[PDB]
Amino acid sequence: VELTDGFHVLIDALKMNDIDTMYGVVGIPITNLARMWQDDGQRFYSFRHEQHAGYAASIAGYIEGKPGVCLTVSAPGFLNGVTSLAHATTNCFPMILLSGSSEREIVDLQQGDYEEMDQMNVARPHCKASFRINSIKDIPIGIARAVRTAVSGRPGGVYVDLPAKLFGQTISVEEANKLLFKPIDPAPAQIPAEDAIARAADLIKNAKRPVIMLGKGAAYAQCDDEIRALVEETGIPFLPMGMAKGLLPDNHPQSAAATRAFALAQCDVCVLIGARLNWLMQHGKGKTWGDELKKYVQIDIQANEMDSNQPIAAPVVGDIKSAVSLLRKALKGAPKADAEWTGALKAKVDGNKAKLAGKMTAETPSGMMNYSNSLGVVRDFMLANPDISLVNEGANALDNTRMIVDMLKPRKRLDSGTWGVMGIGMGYCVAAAAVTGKPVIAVEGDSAFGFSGMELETICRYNLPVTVIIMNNGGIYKGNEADPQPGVISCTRLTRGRYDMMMEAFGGKGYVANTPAELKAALEEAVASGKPCLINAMIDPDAGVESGRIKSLNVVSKV
Amino acid sequence: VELTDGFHVLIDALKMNDIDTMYGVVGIPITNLARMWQDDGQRFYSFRHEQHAGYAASIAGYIEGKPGVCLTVSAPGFLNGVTSLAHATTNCFPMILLSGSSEREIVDLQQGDYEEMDQMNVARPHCKASFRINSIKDIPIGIARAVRTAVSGRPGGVYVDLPAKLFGQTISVEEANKLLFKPIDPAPAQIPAEDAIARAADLIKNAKRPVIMLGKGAAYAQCDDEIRALVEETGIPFLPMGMAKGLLPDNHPQSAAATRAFALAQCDVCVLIGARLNWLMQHGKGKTWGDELKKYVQIDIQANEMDSNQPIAAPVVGDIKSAVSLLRKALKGAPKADAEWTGALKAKVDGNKAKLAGKMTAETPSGMMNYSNSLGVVRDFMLANPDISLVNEGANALDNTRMIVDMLKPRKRLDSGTWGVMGIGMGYCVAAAAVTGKPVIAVEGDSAFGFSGMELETICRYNLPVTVIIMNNGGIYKGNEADPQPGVISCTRLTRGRYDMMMEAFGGKGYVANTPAELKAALEEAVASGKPCLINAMIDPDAGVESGRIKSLNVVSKV
Amino acid sequence: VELTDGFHVLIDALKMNDIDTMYGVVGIPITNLARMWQDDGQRFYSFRHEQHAGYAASIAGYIEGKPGVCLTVSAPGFLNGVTSLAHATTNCFPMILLSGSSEREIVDLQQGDYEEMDQMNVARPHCKASFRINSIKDIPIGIARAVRTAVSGRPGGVYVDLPAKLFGQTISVEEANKLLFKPIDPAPAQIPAEDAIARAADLIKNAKRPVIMLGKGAAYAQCDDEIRALVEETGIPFLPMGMAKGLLPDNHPQSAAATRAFALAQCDVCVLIGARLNWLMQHGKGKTWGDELKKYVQIDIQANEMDSNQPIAAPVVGDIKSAVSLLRKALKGAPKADAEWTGALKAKVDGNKAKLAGKMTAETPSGMMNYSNSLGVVRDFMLANPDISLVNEGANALDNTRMIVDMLKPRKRLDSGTWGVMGIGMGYCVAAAAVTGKPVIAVEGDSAFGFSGMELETICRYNLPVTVIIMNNGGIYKGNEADPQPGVISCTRLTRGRYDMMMEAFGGKGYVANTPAELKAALEEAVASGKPCLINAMIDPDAGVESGRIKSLNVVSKV
Ligand SMILES: CC(C)(COP(=O)(O)OP(=O)(O)OC[C@H]1O[C@@H](n2cnc3c(N)ncnc32)[C@H](O)[C@@H]1OP(=O)(O)O)[C@@H](O)C(=O)NCCC(=O)NCCSC(=O)C(=O)O
Ligand SMILES: CC(C)(COP(=O)(O)OP(=O)(O)OC[C@H]1O[C@@H](n2cnc3c(N)ncnc32)[C@H](O)[C@@H]1OP(=O)(O)O)[C@@H](O)C(=O)NCCC(=O)NCCSC(=O)C(=O)O
Ligand SMILES: CC(C)(COP(=O)(O)OP(=O)(O)OC[C@H]1O[C@@H](n2cnc3c(N)ncnc32)[C@H](O)[C@@H]1OP(=O)(O)O)[C@@H](O)C(=O)NCCC(=O)NCCSC(=O)C(=O)O
Ligand SMILES: Nc1ncnc2c1ncn2[C@@H]1O[C@H](COP(=O)(O)OP(=O)(O)O)[C@@H](O)[C@H]1O
Ligand SMILES: Nc1ncnc2c1ncn2[C@@H]1O[C@H](COP(=O)(O)OP(=O)(O)O)[C@@H](O)[C@H]1O
Ligand SMILES: Nc1ncnc2c1ncn2[C@@H]1O[C@H](COP(=O)(O)OP(=O)(O)O)[C@@H](O)[C@H]1O
Ligand SMILES: Cc1ncc(Cc2csc(CCOP(=O)(O)OP(=O)(O)O)c2C)c(N)n1
Ligand SMILES: Cc1ncc(Cc2csc(CCOP(=O)(O)OP(=O)(O)O)c2C)c(N)n1
Ligand SMILES: Cc1ncc(Cc2csc(CCOP(=O)(O)OP(=O)(O)O)c2C)c(N)n1
Ligand SMILES: [Mg+2]
Ligand SMILES: [Mg+2]
Ligand SMILES: [Mg+2]
């Protein structure tokens, strides 16, 4: 009788759940799983740190709508990955962290095993579910559970512990075929009641000044034409969140993005679609909402998200496709939004964009560019070349890029997310490149970049069409903070370094851009090349403000 | 009334407990703490990732015997630091992680605060104690509790949560000076009973083939002359664990390190001093210990470490200085270890060292150095220049350096430790440089290096006398693994990159060493320059073996 | 300005969410909440132990479909309640545990506060969400979050921490009335996709030997006519799990309950409605299911329950009323189940029931009733008086009562549940009595009874129409285990005690039933009296078997 082992059953189980790519860092006890995966013809991206393989997995999940798979070693490697699993779960990104672990006998008696840790229990706060597969016969079911938990309900992270003993277990090929199965409909549709839809439809119909807020949950849903059809048929102004940019084109005529404060302050009804009323929306209270409670319609898959911050007048619980699809029919033939309202917002949008256009054309000294004229170059490129992933993180580098760089296609803008994480950059580039097979542009704050910078080599090693733009202002927010004591560098200062040289250290192409013309020429050549590039964009050290747009959240001493 | 605030009471409380240095990364809500720390005249080291600021804090704790302090932001930054705290606790290194956290009310209802996380509860598995200081009046007590918990008993990590709202609370200066206090005897001696020492003394006096095993707990204790006096007076052969190297000079004539397998297998009594019978010692069982239970004598401050893995015949619970001092007096005038035992080991040491000398003189082609002739250069340099910290990590780069590079001085060798962590390299360098004010050499596997490599810029930014030697073999264990499929790079491969160029991108000095002679000149020049340097040492891709010495711990397929 | 406080906002918030009843035990810091709850005109039931107040809350949640509310003190009282919350979550019973907690500042520094515990963090494994309301202004949102979390998705427990300092905070009455709100649609319908229903419909239409398995999730859903209509229209044989008894009347002609082993072993398609393929169903494998994978159809609100144990061919995710309604319409006009299948089962049902009738008429000596003739009396009484709650727990007392005592009405049988808990008896009685306003019979193993027996006094104190039948066989499973040593009582033995006398000690009516005729008169008189009664039913000590039906799950020595 012919035998197979744990390595193969696991490989077969992943493939059966439509997984063909893993991001990770090898080592004991899983190096030979990584190799065999590759030998089978599947893809393995080796990183320089598991955190970044983890961030890659998380955004592969967002883009594709099937969980990104990260593979790590035990204890220290697991720890690094689980930080990324935590981020995924917070952002509602389907992801599976697979980690090897040590001997149950020794771990459970805390005797000091190789890389000892109860990884299953340590993972619990950072994921939807944390499982362990102890036996070969249970791998198919174990992977089904993981995939299902990651993509169903509110998508998120799942941890799957793989004890070292799992892989060397053997079983007959015959009984293995018997156990292998493909889960049926692991991310099922969830349809809301007629009366939940009728209530939301009544709120919208009777609204005087409605706004729609599109969150990245709406973008994740992959029902772009449904969402666009709803906006366009209702004639309701809309506002995208950071990663919902491009869901509808950011230059769509009903976009009130460029007059956001006035839109949220003055609206009466606000339709949240896959967007949480969390810190990014000021918890639905305070000055940004006119110091009043709006009438909210909220469409979310997670029932207990409703009323999490403010009372929701019309909670619609289900998957965005099903809910939006029904709401559209409910509103079919109803009057479009008030022209005095939509025309007021559009007038303030035109004025604000003209003010931005002026700033983007402004002339700065060589090597002392600002956030407007440098990112105006990226803006122009992304308007002509929209089928490109835009990775973005930083403070000023983030907030100015979100404002300035218009996205015309959905799920292209990949950014710091719900936790405002510095560190997602290079991992995000690898996964975007891997899953799209298309170019990536990253607009990186220089401090932001240093959290994942060593992964430039990973990008070079796989010769990915990634162009990393460093907003090199020489620090955190600013590059010019005075020495606090004599000979002592301020804590916010960073070396205004030759990041272009670092890229060329690993076979990449490096550029320095001292002006918008240099930045444009370099960007066009880098993207055209299809090769790994870095552009060291020299920004005025004094051009940024403290914490970007969220300056007011800083705690300052008044004594 | 003259008011002070939480920022300043915290600053003062830390200083009262002899803290003058923090390692971290700034941001909301803790940037102005960092600023004010520096304005006061204390050191803040800003890093590129909080994890490396944390590894830095952990080894500062080891070297100094006073808690290394790491400062982070909430959720994502906290998480990065807590991975290092975990490592500190596992290694018994005193360390305090201070992190800002968000609004109690919003985090507790999970409404989606800015960087929302119950950081206090997430730290719990990764430290000795996890605390939160909520009120200004409790800062001095909170800091006392953290310092005592980190340094007393078995030393380790402590998390201290600092809500955003702590810092802007106010109090009168004479109220604050009333609360401020310095703890008495935060790491007290703990003396063992006379019968504990007599039981140990009896076993040693009756041993036919005794060995002493020194662990890093023994090194941490800073009683080097006392431990050396015990070794010499007793005549007992000794072996250092990785970081206990140099506690006694590695070329001490009683060292059995060059004959470890034989010593441990054939001994009858084994005296453990601050060394756990964990995976590094194969749990005191199996062929490493001649397939039998030795008579173990164990000195440890942790009562319940006793009998963790094998029965301990002479458990001695107390601090190592106190214990060793009593054991010495209990053994006064006793005959020295059997001369035919000490003679047998010495001969095998001489034989094996001579055999290693043969390999270190071996000649290799340009750019294809092996681990013996490359590290033979570092060996000679460290013998001539012993007062230098030696950071080390990797597989072959770690195992070969521990064997070849002799330490003559205590607490200089700083390595991957209990969890065999890749990632500790550049933080360890910063901390060693900071707390010693003397040079640092790092011997880095190239894979290992990539876990903290971006921190080269941090080393350059503070102009530290650090020399990074990259053992550049182009991969994990080996740099020559065949492409598993046409055009697909193996998972164990890395770019054989110009790490020298990367160093020079941030103002550091970079070198390529293709031969031992080039390595020698470069290392001598690098250390003598007193500046940040990186030597890219070109190692034969086929020179290393899988996992170095712990290759049998791999799980391999057979089916 | 007219002020209100936390006590009153909390009272008002609970009432706004349709809460009129709490079960608990008073003390610091929550006695005056209890008092004021009552002063307002709402019910507070004081118990003798918080655990039983909690089991009471859990079954009130099951019966009503709105969260049962338990109130406790900090640490020790909280802990007792949280054991019941754990049970609620495990059984999918909506329940809120409110507990007072101590001072944030003292608990967080672990200084030793009055009843010190991070109760929020200790509850986490035992509920769906663990929250803390810190501020008066967040009470209405906090209570909304708890009610939604408990009732939505898969229903379950929620912990709500109430620091001592919450209650004495104040706010203006018109501010409080501005914050107070009632959540819209806290338990929404969730409708499955048409293809989910069509896949299920296809399998049922092609089944040769279909069965439907009803679980307590189906009973909880309160769509009894709809589920009965499905069973009748399809002609499919059905089986109820313990607490699904009476969903359809147990004497329904399509019931296969009296032929369970054969039905499950020989079926081809098995339709699971609110029933998990857990230990109670042997995980869908082994000889119980003919050693094969059936084609499972499963209706469950929890997406990731699918494929938890065996592959589900037709997963239908959504609320059971919505799902069953669609499945019925999808099966309209389909032929009824194979008559030779339904005929085979019916014959075996008739045979086995006739065989059970033989045992129930059996004659035993005075004071040595068996489980068949004693429970045969309860069977006849419940057939004649079906609108009564039947609480049940024990081993033989549980298994024999589930077999013998037919339920004609839904949500009346209330038993040990998913964890096979001993202890739920007297709390279940109090809650059933409270929420139904109708009589309650408890059939208690004597061991089982002792876990909550002191609550007899609580039943008497509220003069509830509860009749406790103690199946008094003098022990665990059996009352006759030999003394293992001279003068030493066996561990399985109990005093064959005068539980009647115990009842009468608190003003209850007590009976001894030594024969079925005495049991009948006593039960008839007890229930008709409308007063608290206990019937001490004398059972043959040798009548029961080890663990009842789950005796093969015992671990026994063979060496
Ligand atoms: C919280 C927010 C959602 C709040 O939104 P706002 O910033 O107010 O709005 P936007 O960014 O959409 O737009 C900014 C302003 O420019 C306007 N705007 C937008 N687009 C345009 C165009 N095309 N033309 C002209 N003007 C425009 C818009 O109306 C706003 O002005 P007004 O109309 O005047 O309002 C956002 O700031 C955000 O997503 N931030 C993420 C921050 C983060 O995570 N940072 C990393 C951590 S920093 C950190 O942790 C630390 O420092 O420490
Ligand atoms: C577990 C161990 C303590 C076991 O010790 P050993 O390796 O057996 O002993 P040592 O390293 O002390 O010495 C190695 C051998 O060289 C001999 N030796 C030592 N010094 C000398 C000199 N000066 N001259 C000649 N010979 C010498 C010694 O007697 C041993 O041979 P014999 O006496 O003949 O045996 C050690 O391997 C260790 O500390 N490993 C850490 C590994 C690690 O953490 N790696 C990173 C993760 S790797 C990973 O995670 C992954 O691969 O995945
Ligand atoms: C917190 C305490 C240590 C505080 O000590 P005190 O109560 O102040 O002191 P003592 O109890 O020792 O003594 C009480 C007083 O009587 C005096 N005293 C003591 N002994 C004597 C004799 N023999 N003769 C005369 N007087 C005496 C003593 O001086 C005190 O008065 P003065 O000189 O005038 O001070 C104690 O109360 C305690 O241990 N409490 C435990 C409470 C508890 O856990 N209860 C259950 C929870 S109730 C609960 O949770 C809830 O209600 O809810
Ligand atoms: N298919 C889906 N249907 C409905 N809601 C979804 C779906 N996928 C994700 N969501 C929801 O979308 C939300 C994402 O919100 P958030 O991450 O705050 O977006 P943003 O930051 O852009 O506002 C979550 O509340 C999540 O439950
Ligand atoms: N001052 C001290 N006195 C006694 N024991 C100590 C002291 N400091 C640390 N220890 C103990 O020393 C041990 C360190 O062991 P370990 O980390 O396994 O060393 P190694 O890895 O070098 O063998 C721990 O068990 C710890 O409790
Ligand atoms: N309203 C509802 N609609 C659909 N499924 C539900 C509903 N309420 C509870 N459930 C589900 O019903 C199941 C109850 O199963 P279980 O407790 O195993 O029942 P039993 O023990 O009777 O077999 C759970 O899986 C739960 O998710
Ligand atoms: C994991 C983690 N650690 C720290 C932080 C705190 C932070 C927020 S923004 C930032 C860097 C901002 O400077 P950058 O150079 O990137 O952008 P710019 O304004 O253009 O100069 C840090 C360190 C966060 N959010 N996450
Ligand atoms: C956080 C973490 N993730 C992975 C690993 C697993 C590992 C152990 S050793 C190693 C690299 C070995 O290659 P290196 O180049 O450094 O040395 P050399 O043999 O001379 O070529 C890895 C990735 C560990 N230990 N910790
Ligand atoms: C909280 C808890 N602790 C222990 C147990 C274990 C147990 C299962 S059944 C049982 C008692 C069986 O005797 P009983 O008198 O009730 O019934 P009978 O067979 O007719 O004599 C116990 C103690 C469980 N399930 N829960
Ligand atoms: Mg910057
Ligand atoms: Mg290498
Ligand atoms: Mg009994």
From Swiss-Prot, chains A, B, C:
Cofactor binding note: Binds 1 metal ion per subunit. Binds 1 thiamine pyrophosphate per subunit.
Effect caused by changing Y477A: Does not affect oxalyl-CoA binding, but it strongly reduces the catalytic efficiency for oxalyl-CoA
Chain positions recorded as thiamine diphosphate binding sites: Y371, A395, N396, A397, G420, V421, M422, S447, A448, Y477
Reactions catalysed, as given in the entry: oxalyl-CoA + H(+) = formyl-CoA + CO2
A Gene Ontology molecular function term of the record: thiamine pyrophosphate binding
Mitochondrion is among the record's keywords: no
InterPro entries, per the entry: DHS-like_NAD/FAD-binding_dom, HACL1-like, Oxalyl-CoA_decarboxylase, THDP-binding, Thiamin_PyroP_enz_cen_dom, Thiamin_PyroP_enz_TPP-bd_dom, TPP_enzyme_TPP-bd
Swiss-Prot/TrEMBL cofactor(s): a metal cation; thiamine diphosphate
Binding site for ADP: R154, K216, R276, D300, I320
Record: residues binding substrate: I28, Y114, A257, A258, T259, R260, A261, N352, R402, M403, S547, G548, R549
A single GO BP: fatty acid alpha-oxidation
Entry EC no(s): 4.1.1.8
Domain of life: Bacteria
Sorted UniProt keywords: Decarboxylase, Lyase, Magnesium, Metal-binding, Nucleotide-binding, Thiamine pyrophosphate
Description of how the protein assembles with itself and partners: Homotetramer; dimer of dimers.
Family label: Belongs to the TPP enzyme family.
Known function: Involved in the catabolism of oxalate and in the adapatation to low pH via the induction of the oxalate-dependent acid tolerance response (ATR). Essential enzyme for the bacterium survival, as it relies on oxalic acid as its sole source of energy. Catalyzes the decarboxylation of oxalyl-CoA to yield carbon dioxide and formyl-CoA.
Protein's recorded name: Oxalyl-CoA decarboxylase
